[PDB]
Amino acid sequence: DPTIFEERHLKYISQLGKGNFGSVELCRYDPLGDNTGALVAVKQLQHSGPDQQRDFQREIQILKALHSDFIVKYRGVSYGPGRQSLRLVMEYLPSGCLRDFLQRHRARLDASRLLLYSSQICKGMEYLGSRRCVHRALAARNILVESEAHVKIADFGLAKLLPLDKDYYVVRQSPIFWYAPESLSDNIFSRQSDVWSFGVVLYELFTYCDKSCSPSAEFLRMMGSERDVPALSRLLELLEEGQRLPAPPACPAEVHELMKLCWAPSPQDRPSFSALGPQLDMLWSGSR
Numbered sequence: 001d002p003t004i005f006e007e008r009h010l011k012y013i014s015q016l017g018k019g020n021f022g023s024v025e026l027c028r029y030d031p032l033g034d035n036t037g038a039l040v041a042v043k044q045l046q047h048s049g050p051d052q053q054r055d056f057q058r059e060i061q062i063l064k065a066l067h068s069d070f071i072v073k074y075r076g077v078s079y080g081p082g083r084q085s086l087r088l089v090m091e092y093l094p095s096g097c098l099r100d101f102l103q104r105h106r107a108r109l110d111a112s113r114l115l116l117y118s119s120q121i122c123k124g125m126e127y128l129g130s131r132r133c134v135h136r137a138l139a140a141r142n143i144l145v146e147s148e149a150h151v152k153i154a155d156f157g158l159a160k161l162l163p164l165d166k167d168y169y170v171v172r173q174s175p176i177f178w179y180a181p182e183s184l185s186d187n188i189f190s191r192q193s194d195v196w197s198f199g200v201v202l203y204e205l206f207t208y209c210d211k212s213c214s215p216s217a218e219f220l221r222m223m224g225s226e227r228d229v230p231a232l233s234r235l236l237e238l239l240e241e242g243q244r245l246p247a248p249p250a251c252p253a254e255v256h257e258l259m260k261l262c263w264a265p266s267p268q269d270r271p272s273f274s275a276l277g278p279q280l281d282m283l284w285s286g287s288r
């Protein structure tokens, strides 16, 4: 297989991203040993018990089976000495994450371009939904820039397949401001809980991920004067009363509407990615 990478030829360069249980590292796969080999992004676990290694095996098998222009490409695995020596080799995207890209290039990215990214993220998520995969980590910091007009979904650490007979599943740190109320309160996940997240991605795109405008920053402003109330508790109250994130200035009215519907209280009243996609395509193709 060209998908088996020998541990001894992967040369560590730097850290790309980092969680509790693992990290993604910039590496060179250097079979000729002369520092000319291709650069790859390599995931491995540290602080890993049986559960983490089991989930990582799932991560690998999911990403391996996906073949989308808008999802980060699987290249292979490696394995070596330890029981924690399993690696997931992926393509390396040097432009980095969309969050950082929007913060840097804010002033030259119009609504038309944010709409193109929106439409590309939505297609990636339609593709996952056709494979019955719930992503669970959809946020701009986990979207990658392949080029200035092309983004890809990354971080499949938490992704999980739906049973063949059920359209949700239940689990036993989450990014609380990206999560659907039913996920927060009841650990219920589905393609419809990813829709809620996507709405918050839209809000990230159309605020250019400005840190003054962030979901957390808006929450601290929506909070009232009671700042010793737990975030999650108060968020859940806020969402139940119908408070939502405000519409950014940059946001076309039609995209604000799509965000609100993404935040339909009930998961069944949320539009699917199949229904969101044509609208965003309408708007993007209409704004060239």
Ligand SMILES: N#CCCc1ccc(-c2nc3cnc4[nH]ccc4c3n2C2CCCCC2)o1
Binding pocket: 016, 017, 018, 024, 041, 072, 090, 091, 092, 093, 094, 096, 097, 141, 142, 144, 154, 155
């Ligand atoms: N969460 C978070 C932090 C966001 C951040 C900053 C820099 C990067 C990043 N550059 C990458 C370049 N090529 C890559 N191939 C596969 C993952 C990957 C890259 N990642 C991530 C590594 C961690 C998972 C999300 C993507 O991400």
Ligand SMILES: NC(=O)Nc1ccccc1
Binding pocket: 177, 199, 200, 215, 216, 218, 219, 222, 238, 243, 244, 245, 263
């Ligand atoms: N989806 C949504 O509106 N979430 C939200 C609302 C208020 C503060 C922070 C996040």
